[PDB]
Design an enzyme around this catalytic site. Structure first.
Site, PDB file in Angstrom:
ATOM      1  N   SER A 105       0.837  -1.209   0.000  1.00  0.00           N
ATOM      2  CA  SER A 105       0.000   0.000   0.000  1.00  0.00           C
ATOM      3  C   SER A 105       0.887   1.281   0.000  1.00  0.00           C
ATOM      4  O   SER A 105       1.731   1.403  -0.892  1.00  0.00           O
ATOM      5  CB  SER A 105      -0.993  -0.085   1.166  1.00  0.00           C
ATOM      6  OG  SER A 105      -2.056   0.858   1.115  1.00  0.00           O
ATOM      7  N   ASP A 222     -10.014  -4.840  -4.996  1.00  0.00           N
ATOM      8  CA  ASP A 222      -9.400  -3.930  -4.026  1.00  0.00           C
ATOM      9  C   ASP A 222     -10.060  -2.555  -4.121  1.00  0.00           C
ATOM     10  O   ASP A 222      -9.998  -1.905  -5.169  1.00  0.00           O
ATOM     11  CB  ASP A 222      -7.885  -3.834  -4.286  1.00  0.00           C
ATOM     12  CG  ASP A 222      -7.054  -3.090  -3.240  1.00  0.00           C
ATOM     13  OD1 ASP A 222      -7.609  -2.158  -2.564  1.00  0.00           O
ATOM     14  OD2 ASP A 222      -5.835  -3.362  -3.155  1.00  0.00           O
ATOM     15  N   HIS A 252      -7.665  -5.999  -0.425  1.00  0.00           N
ATOM     16  CA  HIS A 252      -6.441  -5.208  -0.327  1.00  0.00           C
ATOM     17  C   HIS A 252      -5.248  -5.914   0.342  1.00  0.00           C
ATOM     18  O   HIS A 252      -4.131  -5.826  -0.164  1.00  0.00           O
ATOM     19  CB  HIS A 252      -6.779  -3.874   0.379  1.00  0.00           C
ATOM     20  CG  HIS A 252      -5.666  -2.876   0.445  1.00  0.00           C
ATOM     21  ND1 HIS A 252      -5.129  -2.310  -0.695  1.00  0.00           N
ATOM     22  CD2 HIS A 252      -5.038  -2.355   1.527  1.00  0.00           C
ATOM     23  CE1 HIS A 252      -4.188  -1.485  -0.288  1.00  0.00           C
ATOM     24  NE2 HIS A 252      -4.082  -1.502   1.046  1.00  0.00           N
TER      25      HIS A 252
HETATM   26  C1  LIG Z   1      -2.121   2.106   2.032  1.00  0.00           C
HETATM   27  O1  LIG Z   1      -1.375   2.224   3.025  1.00  0.00           O
HETATM   28  N1  LIG Z   1      -3.124   3.075   1.700  1.00  0.00           N
HETATM   29  C2  LIG Z   1      -4.036   3.716   2.665  1.00  0.00           C
HETATM   30  C3  LIG Z   1      -5.183   3.576   1.606  1.00  0.00           C
HETATM   31  C4  LIG Z   1      -5.625   4.895   1.176  1.00  0.00           C
HETATM   32  N2  LIG Z   1      -5.153   5.733   0.240  1.00  0.00           N
HETATM   33  C5  LIG Z   1      -5.997   6.895   0.392  1.00  0.00           C
HETATM   34  C6  LIG Z   1      -5.863   8.153  -0.387  1.00  0.00           C
HETATM   35  C7  LIG Z   1      -6.674   9.279  -0.067  1.00  0.00           C
HETATM   36  C8  LIG Z   1      -6.558  10.456  -0.818  1.00  0.00           C
HETATM   37  C9  LIG Z   1      -5.650  10.523  -1.891  1.00  0.00           C
HETATM   38  C10 LIG Z   1      -4.851   9.414  -2.211  1.00  0.00           C
HETATM   39  C11 LIG Z   1      -4.952   8.237  -1.471  1.00  0.00           C
HETATM   40  N3  LIG Z   1      -6.909   6.663   1.400  1.00  0.00           N
HETATM   41  O2  LIG Z   1      -6.677   5.435   1.874  1.00  0.00           O
HETATM   42  C12 LIG Z   1      -4.157   2.848   0.673  1.00  0.00           C
END
Ligand SMILES: *C(=O)N1CC(c2nc(-c3ccccc3)no2)C1
Length: 280
Positions: A105, A222, A252
């Site tokens: 992630s 996901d 995810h």
């Molecule tokens: C992994 O660690 N991540 C957290 C999950 C994620 N990404 C976002 C997000 C919000 C705004 C702009 C870009 C990304 N919110 O939760 C994936």
């Protein structure tokens, strides 16, 4: 008291090591996602250690057992800078050994940006559903302006927590996630959301210069990191050695999914690293 490191900002980062019995064949840094910590990579790290790899990690600032306000960062680059500090320290003690990165992630976005900053330095990268794409509405000029306006008056305002049921189809793993005191399950702060927007924008610009070999693992269902971002990474990265594996209907957290998916994920990482470690 605990294994640690002091970052460039004078903050203590909690460190974790999984050292093999004999002499290591390679080094591998494990980069965790947003809200979680290094303790969640115990099983993956034991498997990697069994291949004679020296596995190492730290909790990112504002996460797990490391210092800092929870899920807050002055600039996203702090995470990349701290990974490089840890990598450089390990390489001093183990000179000439190949070094790999494993990211999930947000940890995957950190791994990409770490490799992009040092072209030709890393032997390979394992990406588990990496953060590479911004949500549809989230990244418009209007939405970026609104969030920046909000950040000036209420930086710690929570966007609202997510349904933890989107993380994995494995209900036991959702329950483990929900009861881990080292996990921040509080909703995403406006200031941190802006930093994740910076991360995605920086990833996109880094792809034409990304040459590091990589294995990309992605679930088709996901809801946090959309599968189309995995296809775009395969297309836009300049790497000569790139592999994509799609897990049909998987969510995810692939390394904490249904046993059939998790067993395949572990086996694929095992084979991929093993083939590039024999190469050393
Ligand atoms: C992994 O660690 N991540 C957290 C999950 C994620 N990404 C976002 C997000 C919000 C705004 C702009 C870009 C990304 N919110 O939760 C994936």
């Amino acid at each position: 008291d605990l294994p640690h490191l002091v970052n460039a900002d004078g903050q203590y980062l909690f460190c974790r090591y999984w050292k093999p019995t004999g002499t290591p064949k390679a080094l591998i840094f494990v980069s965790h996602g947003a809200g979680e910590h290094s303790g969640r990579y115990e099983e993956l790290a034991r498997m990697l250690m069994g291949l004679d790899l020296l596995v190492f990690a730290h909790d990112h600032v504002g996460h797990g057992q490391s210092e800092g306000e929870r899920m807050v960062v002055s600039d996203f680059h702090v995470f990349v800078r701290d990974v490089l500090q840890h990598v450089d320290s390990m390489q001093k003690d183990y000179p000439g050994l190949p070094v790999f990165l494993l990211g999930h992630s947000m940890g995957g976005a950190i791994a990409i940006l770490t490799a992009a900053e040092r072209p030709g330095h890393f032997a390979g990268m394992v990406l588990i559903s990496p953060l590479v794409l911004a949500n549809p509405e989230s990244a418009t000029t209007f939405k970026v302006l609104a969030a920046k306006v909000l950040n000036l008056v209420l930086p710690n305002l929570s966007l609202g927590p997510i349904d933890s049921s989107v993380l994995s189809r494995n209900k036991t793993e959702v329950d483990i996630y929900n009861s881990d005191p080292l996990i921040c399950r509080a909703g995403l702060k406006v200031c941190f959301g802006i930093q994740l927007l910076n991360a995605v924008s920086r990833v996109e610009r880094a792809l034409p210069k990304l040459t590091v070999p990589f294995l990309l693992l992605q679930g088709s269902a996901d809801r946090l990191c959309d599968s189309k971002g995995a296809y775009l990474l395969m297309e836009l990265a300049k790497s000569q050695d790139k592999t994509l594996k799609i897990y049909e209907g998987a969510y995810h957290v692939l390394h904490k999914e249904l046993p059939e998916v998790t067993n395949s994920v572990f086996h694929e990482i095992n084979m991929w690293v093993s083939q590039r470690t024999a190469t050393a």
